[PDB]
Ligand binder design. Structure first.
Ligand code: FAD
Ligand code: FAD
Ligand code: C17
Ligand code: C17
Lengths: 499, 494
C-alpha cells in the first residue's frame, strides 16, 4: 500500500529513477507489468548462446550516464568487432571498405553524398535539443516527411537510397512515416550523423559483458521486494490527498508522487481520474513505436574474419530481409554470431514466416553478401519480434509522424499534477537509447526531490562527467567536406561562368 | 456475470449491435465507460437551448441505416436551413452564392478549382470501399500526405486554400497529418465530394428533432437493465471456455462472444490475455482521432435571413477561429443560432482561451462575415471541446497518417478469436458518421450470429432499402466540368 513514490515501469528508466530516489532515503515501489524487469532490454540465457541481448544492447562514447550507472553496478563493456573491412552491398554486389561511411568515387555522386550528410547536420544545428519546436523553421520542417526532404535534397538515386537505409535503421520506420523536424532533432540530439552511424567512436562501439539486461536486474537486487512483478497498472487517481495507483491483479498503492517510466503511448493502458489534460490525452494516441525483428544466427566460427570482413554489412535492396548487421561473437571469440535487423515494413512482411523460414532467408543473404558457403551452415538461431509486445508496442523507440512534434511535443515531459514523466522518449541527449532512459529517469526523480523541497531548482538537470573508460573522439570534418558545393550549387556555378 | 454476448461501448454502434442480438433472442450486456450512453453523440438539454447536439448531429440522403433505426425508435428529422444564400469570405470580404460550391471568377483559378474537385473524385473511383489497400496505386498514394498531393495538384493559392479548408472540415486534421490514400478513400466511401460537402442532397441535409443523443438513449430504454453505465472495460481474457470481461469497478462478465464498439485506438485501454496478435497490437497505436471544438452561438432571431443569408459561412484564412458554420435554428424558427467548428490546429491553439474569450472572437468574426452588428449581441453560448474526452480521444473520427492504411488497414475489422469489431471506423459506407456506426454494429452482430450457426454467410453483410422520408437524388456534373483542362493541360496546349 503506502510509500513516497510509485514508479510505473521497471525498464532502465524506471529502475534508474527508483535507485536515485531510494539512495536519497525515500520509500519507493516499482510496478512492473511483466514477469521480468528490463523492458526493451532483454538478455536471454541458454546453453547454446550463453547470453544474448534480444533488445537494447550497444553503448558508446558520449553516453556517459549509462556507462556510469552500469560501472557502479559492477558491469564491464567490450568492443564490437571492427578490426577488418565493412561491406556495403548494393545492386547485388559487395564493396569492402574502411571508415564509417561507404566511399563514393563518382565526383557528382560524391558531391551529393557529401552534401546530404553535411545538410542533415547543418539543419540539426538550428534545432534546440530541449525544445525542437523552437527551431526557426520548425513548422515548415515538421509539416514534411523525411521522404519529402530526401526527394528535395538528394540529386542522385545513390544518395537517396543510402539516406533511406539511414532513416530505416535509425528509427525503425519508413521515410514517409516520420516528421523531417522530428528526425533531424533525433539525429542532432545523439550528436550528429557520424556519431550515430559509427561503431568505433559512435553509438555501436561497445556492448556489456553478460548482457544489458543486467542493469535492470542488478538494480532490482538492490531494491529487493520494492520491485513488484506482474503488476500492470490500470488506474491512477489524483483526486485525493495522496495518489492512488491500482494494478490489474487487484492491488492498490498509495504515494505522494508517481513517475510514469513507460513509452508515451502505453500511457493509454491506464485510466486517469481526473482525465488527462487535452494536449496529453491526444498526444498519447499520436506517438507510435517503430517495427523491428532482431535476429542472431550462430556459426561454428567467425568465418568472415578469415576473408578480412569484420561482420558489418550495410545491405541495400528490397529483396534483402536484413539491411544491417554486426558481428555478435563473444569477446573470448566463441559463440560466433551475426546480429541483423529486419526493419520497418520488412518486420511486418516477414513476421508471417516461421522461425525456420526466416533463418533460411538470412543465411542465403549472408552467403551472397559475404561470398561464403559457410554462411549456409548455422548451428543455432535466436530472434525477437518487438512488434508483438503488449508492454512495449515496438522498438527501438517512439517516432513522431508529420505535424505532431510542433503541436504536442511541449507536453511530453510536462508534469500532470503529481505524475512526473521519465522514459527514454523524454530525454534530451540520446533519447531513444538506454543512455536517454538513464537521463530521463534521474531527471524525473530529481523533479520530485525539488517538489519535496529536498534539492534546489538548479539541481534538477545535472551534467555528467565524461567516462574515463570510453573517451569520446571529437567529430571532425575536412576543408573539402566543408566547402565543396552541392549538386545544385555546382550547377549554379556553371550557369554563372557560362553567363 | 453470464450472458451470450458482451458489447464494449454504448455509442450508436454498440447499441445497434446489442439491439440486433437482443431482438434475435440472445442475452446481451453493454459495458459503457461513461455515466451516459451516446459516445461521440451528446444532446445537452437546458431551458436556454431546449436541446442542442454538441457531437454528431447531421444526417442526409444515402444514410439509410441510421434513418431506418431512428424511425423505428420513433424519431423524426427536419431540414437544415439552406433557403437563402451561402457566404464565402475571402481576403476580408463576403461573397454570397447559391449551389454547393463557391464560385470562381478568374479563368485560370476557375480551371484549377474545377480540376481539383474532379481529380479527387477520379482518384476515388480506383479505391475499393471495403479494401482501400487494394487500390492499384495504394502504396504510392498512402506514402504521400494530402499536403503533398495538394502542392502537386493546385496551381493557384486560391484552389490550395479552399482544398485545405475542405480537408480540415472533413477530417478535423491538417493536410500534412493525413495519408492521401486514406483521405481519398474517406471521400469516396461517403459518395464523393458533392455528396460530402452538400447540405441540400448531402450529408448535412437534416438533423433529428430532439437531438441525435436520443438514438442511444431510446435503445438503452429498450435494453432494460442490460446496459451497465460507468463500466469501463480494463481486461479481456480469452484463454478459457467462456470469454471473461472485467471492468474498472471490479465486476466480471462471462460470455461466448465480445463485440468491441469503441474507436480502434481506445482498444489500448484494455489489457488482453492472450496478448493481441502483432498487427493489431501495433495498429491501435497508429490511429489518432482529429481535433474539434463544436461551438453554438444563440441570438434573439435568425437575423441573417433578413439579409438573404442562410447562415452557412465558408471562411478562408488563418486568422478566423471558425472556417465553417451552419444555421442551427430550430424548425419552429426559435432558439436562433449559428453552429461553427474550430478545426484541427485552431482547436489546439484556441483551447487555452476562456469560454467567454472564444465567444467574443466568434461574435466579432460573425459580425464581419454577416455584415451585421446583431452578431455582437449573443443571448447564450454552448461549446464542446472533444479533444479532452478520455473515452472518445477526439472527433469526428479516426484518421490514418501516411503509410498506415496499406500496412495495417486490413486488420481493422478482422476478428480476434471470439472478439468482433464494430465502431464507425469499421464501416464501408459513411465510416466516420452515425450511419457507419449502425452499419458496423449490425454487421459485427451478424458475424456472431453466423458463428453461432444461426444465419448463413451471405446474411452477414446486408443492403439497406432507401428511406422514403429522405430520398437521394443523383449527383450530376456538366459537360464543361468533365472536359475543361487543368492549368498544366491548358499550358500543354500553349
Ligand atoms: C527493442 C530494441 C531496443 C533497442 C535496440 C534494439 C531493439 C531491438 N538497440 C539499442 C541499442 O543497441 N542501444 C541502446 O542504447 N538502445 C537500444 N534500443 C532501445 C533501448 O532498449 C530503449 O531505449 C530503452 O530500453 C528504453 O528504456 P525505458 O526504461 O525508457 O522503457 P522500457 O524499456 O520500455 O521500460 C518500460 C517498462 O514499463 C513496463 N510497463 C508498460 N506498461 C506498464 C503498465 N501499464 N504498468 C506497469 N508497467 C508497465 C514494461 O513492461 C517495461 O518493463
Ligand atoms: C464529436 C463529433 C462527431 C461528429 C460530428 C461532430 C462532432 C463534434 N458531426 C457528425 C455529424 O454531423 N453527423 C454524423 O453522422 N457524425 C458526426 N460525427 C461523428 C459521429 O458522432 C460518430 O461517427 C459516431 O457517433 C460514432 O459512433 P460509435 O458508436 O462508432 O463510437 P462512439 O460514439 O465513440 O462510442 C463508443 C463508446 O465506447 C465507450 N468506451 C470507450 N472506451 C471504453 C471502455 N474501455 N469500456 C467501455 N466503454 C468504452 C465510449 O464512452 C462510448 O460511449
Ligand atoms: O540508431 C540506432 C542504431 C542501432 C544499431 O544497432 O545500428 C545503427 C547503425 C546506424 O548506421 C550504420 C550505417 C553506416 C553507414 C551508412 C549507413 Cl546508412 C548506416 C545508425 C543507427 C543505428
Ligand atoms: O465531413 C463532415 C462535415 C460535417 C459538417 O457538419 O459539415 C461539413 C461540411 C462540408 O463541406 C462544406 C464546404 C462547402 C463548400 C466548400 C468547402 Cl471547401 C466546404 C464537409 C464536411 C462536413
Amino acid at each position: 500500500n503506502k510509500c513516497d513514490v510509485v514508479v510505473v515501469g521497471g525498464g532502465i528508466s524506471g529502475m534508474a529513477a527508483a535507485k536515485l530516489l531510494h539512495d536519497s532515503g525515500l520509500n519507493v515501489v516499482v510496478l512492473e507489468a511483466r514477469d521480468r524487469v528490463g523492458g526493451r532490454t532483454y538478455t536471454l540465457r541458454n546453453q547454446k548462446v550463453k547470453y544474448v541481448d534480444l533488445g537494447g544492447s550497444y553503448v558508446g562514447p558520449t553516453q556517459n550516464r549509462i556507462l556510469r550507472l552500469a560501472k557502479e553496478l559492477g558491469l564491464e563493456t567490450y568492443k564490437v568487432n571492427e578490426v577488418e573491412r565493412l561491406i556495403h552491398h548494393v545492386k547485388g554486389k559487395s564493396y569492402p571498405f574502411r571508415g564509417p561511411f561507404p566511399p563514393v568515387w563518382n565526383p557528382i555522386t560524391y558531391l551529393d553524398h557529401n552534401n546530404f550528410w553535411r545538410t542533415m547536420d547543418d539543419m540539426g544545428r538550428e534545432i534546440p535539443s530541449d525544445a525542437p519546436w523552437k527551431a526557426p523553421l520548425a513548422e515548415e520542417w515538421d509539416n514534411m516527411t523525411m521522404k519529402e526532404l530526401l526527394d528535395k535534397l538528394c540529386w542522385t538515386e545513390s544518395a537517396k537510397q543510402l539516406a533511406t537505409l539511414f532513416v530505416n535503421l535509425c528509427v525503425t520506420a519508413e521515410t514517409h512515416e516520420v516528421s523531417a523536424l522530428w528526425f533531424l532533432w533525433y539525429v542532432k540530439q545523439c550528436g550528429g550523423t557520424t556519431r550515430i552511424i559509427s561503431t568505433t567512436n559512435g553509438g555501436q562501439e561497445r556492448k556489456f559483458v553478460g548482457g544489458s539486461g543486467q542493469v535492470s536486474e542488478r538494480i532490482m537486487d538492490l531494491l529487493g521486494d520494492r520491485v513488484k512483478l506482474e503488476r500492470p497498472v490500470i488506474y491512477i487517481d489524483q483526486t485525493r490527498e495522496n495518489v492512488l495507483v491500482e494494478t490489474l491483479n487487484h492491488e492498490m498503492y498509495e504515494a505522494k508522487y508517481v513517475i510514469s517510466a513507460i513509452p508515451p503511448t502505453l500511457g493509454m493502458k491506464i485510466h486517469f481520474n481526473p482525465p488527462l489534460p487535452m494536449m496529453r490525452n491526444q498526444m498519447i494516441t499520436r506517438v507510435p513505436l517503430g517495427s523491428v525483428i532482431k535476429c542472431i544466427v550462430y556459426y561454428k566460427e567467425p568465418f568472415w574474419r578469415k576473408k578480412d570482413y569484420c561482420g558489418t554489412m550495410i545491405i541495400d535492396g528490397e529483396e534483402a530481409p536484413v539491411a544491417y548487421t554486426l558481428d555478435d561473437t563473444k569477446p573470448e571469440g566463441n559463440y560466433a554470431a551475426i546480429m541483423g535487423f529486419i526493419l520497418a515494413h520488412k518486420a511486418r512482411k516477414l513476421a508471417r514466416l516461421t522461425k525456420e523460414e526466416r533463418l533460411k532467408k538470412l543465411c542465403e543473404l549472408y552467403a551472397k553478401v559475404l561470398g561464403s558457403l559457410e554462411a549456409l551452415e548455422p548451428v543455432h538461431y535466436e530472434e525477437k519480434n518487438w512488434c508483438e509486445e503488449q508492454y512495449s508496442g515496438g522498438c527501438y523507440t517512439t517516432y513522431f509522424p508529420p505535424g505532431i512534434l510542433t503541436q504536442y511535443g511541449r507536453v511530453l515531459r510536462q508534469p500532470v499534477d503529481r505524475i512526473y514523466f521519465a522514459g527514454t522518449e523524454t530525454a534530451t541527449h540520446w533519447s531513444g537509447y538506454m543512455e536517454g532512459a538513464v537521463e530521463a529517469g534521474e531527471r524525473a526523480a530529481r523533479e520530485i526531490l525539488h517538489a519535496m523541497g529536498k534539492i534546489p531548482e538548479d539541481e534538477i538537470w545535472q551534467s555528467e562527467p565524461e567516462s574515463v573508460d570510453v573517451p569520446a573522439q571529437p567529430i571532425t570534418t575536412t576543408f573539402l567536406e566543408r566547402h565543396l558545393p552541392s549538386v545544385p550549387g555546382l550547377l549554379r556555378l556553371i550557369g554563372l561562368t557560362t553567363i
